[PDB]
Design a protein around this ligand. Sequence first.
Ligand SMILES: *[C@@H]1O[C@H](CO)[C@@H](O[C@@H]2O[C@H](CO)[C@@H](O[C@@H]3O[C@H](CO[C@H]4O[C@H](CO)[C@@H](O)[C@H](O[C@H]5O[C@H](CO)[C@@H](O)[C@H](O)[C@@H]5O[C@H]5O[C@H](CO)[C@@H](O)[C@H](O)[C@@H]5O)[C@@H]4O)[C@@H](O)[C@H](O[C@H]4O[C@H](CO)[C@@H](O)[C@H](O)[C@@H]4O[C@H]4O[C@H](CO)[C@@H](O)[C@H](O)[C@@H]4O)[C@@H]3O)[C@H](O)[C@H]2NC(C)=O)[C@H](O)[C@H]1NC(C)=O
Ligand SMILES: Cn1c(COc2cc(Cl)c(C#N)cc2-c2cc(OC3CC3)ccc2F)n[nH]c1=O
Ligand SMILES: [Ca+2]
Ligand SMILES: [Ca+2]
Ligand code: NA
Ligand code: NA
Ligand SMILES: [Zn+2]
Length: 805
Amino acid sequence: WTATSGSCKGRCFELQEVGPPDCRCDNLCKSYSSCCHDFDELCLKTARGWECTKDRCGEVRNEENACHCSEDCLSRGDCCTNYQVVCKGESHWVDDDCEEIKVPECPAGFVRPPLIIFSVDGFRASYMKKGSKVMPNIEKLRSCGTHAPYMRPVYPTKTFPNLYTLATGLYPESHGIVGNSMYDPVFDASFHLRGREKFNHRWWGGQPLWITATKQGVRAGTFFWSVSIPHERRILTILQWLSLPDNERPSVYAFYSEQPDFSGHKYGPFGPEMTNPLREIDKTVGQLMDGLKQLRLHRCVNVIFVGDHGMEDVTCDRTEFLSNYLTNVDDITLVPGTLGRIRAKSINNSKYDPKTIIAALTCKKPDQHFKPYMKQHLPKRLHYANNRRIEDIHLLVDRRWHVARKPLDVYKKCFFQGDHGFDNKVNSMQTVFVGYGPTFKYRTKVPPFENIELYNVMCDLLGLKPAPNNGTHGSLNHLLRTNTFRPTMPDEVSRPNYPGIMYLQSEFDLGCTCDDKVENKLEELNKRLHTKGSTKERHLLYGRPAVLYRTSYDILYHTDFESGYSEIFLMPLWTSYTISKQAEVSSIPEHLTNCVRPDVRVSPGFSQNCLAYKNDKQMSYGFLFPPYLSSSPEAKYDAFLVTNMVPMYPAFKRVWAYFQRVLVKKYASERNGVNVISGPIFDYNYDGLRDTEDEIKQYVEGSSIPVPTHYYSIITSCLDFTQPADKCDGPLSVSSFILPHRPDNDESCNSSEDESKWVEELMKMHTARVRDIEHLTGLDFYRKTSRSYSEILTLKTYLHTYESE
Ligand SMILES: *[C@@H]1O[C@H](CO)[C@@H](O[C@@H]2O[C@H](CO)[C@@H](O[C@@H]3O[C@H](CO[C@H]4O[C@H](CO)[C@@H](O)[C@H](O[C@H]5O[C@H](CO)[C@@H](O)[C@H](O)[C@@H]5O[C@H]5O[C@H](CO)[C@@H](O)[C@H](O)[C@@H]5O)[C@@H]4O)[C@@H](O)[C@H](O[C@H]4O[C@H](CO)[C@@H](O)[C@H](O)[C@@H]4O[C@H]4O[C@H](CO)[C@@H](O)[C@H](O)[C@@H]4O)[C@@H]3O)[C@H](O)[C@H]2NC(C)=O)[C@H](O)[C@H]1NC(C)=O
Ligand SMILES: Cn1c(COc2cc(Cl)c(C#N)cc2-c2cc(OC3CC3)ccc2F)n[nH]c1=O
Ligand SMILES: [Ca+2]
Ligand SMILES: [Ca+2]
Ligand code: NA
Ligand code: NA
Ligand SMILES: [Zn+2]
């Protein structure tokens, strides 16, 4: 119930929300059906429109007008945005040359430059260039400030997950807004775009920027605008708020546009009808900047122009129907569209079975435009699994397609020509970032980055301490003139042991064999030096990774590679080696095919054993340092040490062996050498974080050898590829992956073909940031470079996307 007979007189767009049943005058009251009776009359005035004209200049103040052109309007803070231009001979902001803003130039009483976030729904990254002729205000912001060529959204590339990610710095799995539609089984409640349940506070986890600000004594304008409030009125409301007295005035503001998304759905991303919405958004930007110029705030405020996601061409005819695959289609509930999420229609049906649904959806049609996954098998870069609102069965839909349950769902709901929601590495889903203001850099282009990083920066721009989030604070310091955040490297928690030769061969009873009993003071001193670390500067280029948790591990040196060997997990946490451009690939000789050799530095009790692999009919093994890349026949023996062995399903070995035999050398040739760090990952609870020993769900049969869920590699070289990887003076270049360790290759529909037709494709799907691997291993990489730490943080957040330009 609302008692709507209170009044909004003097309360229009009040910042504090008053309590039911008392009627509301804030910019949300419409959305709750709670505004006071006179809200439209007082707060949504429209008379005479939004622009001054010569005849209105000087006019007698009429309080009915939407905005004012009278002489007292500047002092009142409610002039039309073009007032000084029409009436006082001033230029529009867009017509002024840009001039570097070296320091904030702010009115007296201003404690800090305010921040205005100008968010645009569905603003695809390529609009900045493709629409630049019709967006002159945005183009000035872009060219004069700091811009990225694009910004990567989070998955799913839908509105609310992305806007809330912007506000919180959190992946959707952590903030809880995992789609525009959701079912939460603990609450037994549904979240929808339409209607009221979405305002219930239990949906919204983490701590958004407005709450962070408020808790630290920084006042915030509203972030949500009711759709019926016109854009011109949103802008005038912000400008009015900026004219409040110092004790009442907010420091952070947001504007939101429903465009160009609204039109992009109807017309496609580049429909000829899209020009006008881009013109209109640019006009709104111009109103804001003209309004700030009038208030003398245009060289004081930091402005962020940012989108939530892009827009792709999608039509009704490009729909796959689950009724063409499943017999049981009425026993499921599908969240449809540009992603699929499946669960049982009824929790009373014990005949429901995910394995049979997955199998019925796997590689069934030759051009099939979706791929099913148990959520824990989705690419780890998506960070889309650790929330009870994400259904166990997921369909990753190809760009340009939809999935639906049955045809009747599509024609009883062609209308649309655009949609979004796809995998966040798809080029059409990329969106925009521009920062303009005293705290941003001048005429600066920065590389593409992920929207999860912005919360930290917005916190820095307002002097706030960010709440815990998934950004890497410092990774965007290169966007900023000042207010940089100067982090220190985390302290190492566990220091390594450096074991020497402590065990005789006969102490081992591992069931392993090796044809190796074959024999010199010249080369005996030499192999001793390699086991003490004499080649380690070549193989460990950026220092040893730091272990950020309590554990017991050994550093093991060898001619061709260095490793950190875990006594707890019985395998390396990491293995580091450098392959020059000139390295040669050799085979595993016949006599060494089944060779595994005890490591005399490491006790039997802290070693793997071959009997386990013999007994485990499902499990085989691989090696972290590949025998194919040994520097010499004698060095090759090192690669067969039991301390370099890891558990691998035979199906996964096809992937791994192709990576190691073909791809590493290919990358060294293309990149002028590479440094490779490889290792296992254990994430049985799919939380994106290193598992402890007691979370491991699978072991090599009959043993304590834990089975990884994933294998990673981090592949580093010189950005200036005229320098070899091992003699690089400047910035680094990286690509990494986190490959799922699966007992089948059902993910790869073409896996019966030669690995040259499908392995690399799989690896690109599972591309990762170094930071993703850090979370999953508790390791900290690149500890010893000649580079700045901020630069290294940027490197650690880089994702190699494999999309064209
Ligand atoms: C991305 O960044 C985020 C933020 O930094 C990272 O997320 C954090 O990760 C931590 C580890 O997973 C986690 O720490 C736990 O916090 C528990 C208390 O948490 C509550 O309070 C916080 C702070 O105000 C709040 O933010 C939380 O909100 C969650 O839950 C509500 C819904 O109920 C949502 O509104 C919200 O969206 C959020 O959900 C998300 O997080 C939870 C996990 O907290 C998930 O379950 C959801 O799926 C969703 O993703 C909370 O309300 C604390 O109790 C935990 O402590 C246990 O474990 C420690 C280990 O040392 C142990 O000492 C204790 O014994 C304790 O165990 C006991 O409980 C166990 C579980 O019931 C039980 O089995 C045991 O036997 C014990 O009895 C723990 O410290 C932190 O809360 C989240 N924060 C957020 C915001 O998500 C995230 O990791 C980053 N991602 C990557 C990939 O890096
Ligand atoms: C989508 N949309 C908006 C714009 O919303 C936001 C704009 C920005 Cl710039 C940011 C950031 N950072 C955050 C939001 C936002 C606001 C919310 O408010 C709670 C009452 C629900 C909830 C989630 C959000 F993510 N207004 N109207 C409308 O339809
Ligand atoms: Ca959107
Ligand atoms: Ca885990
Ligand atoms: Na086996
Ligand atoms: Na297959
Ligand atoms: Zn949309």
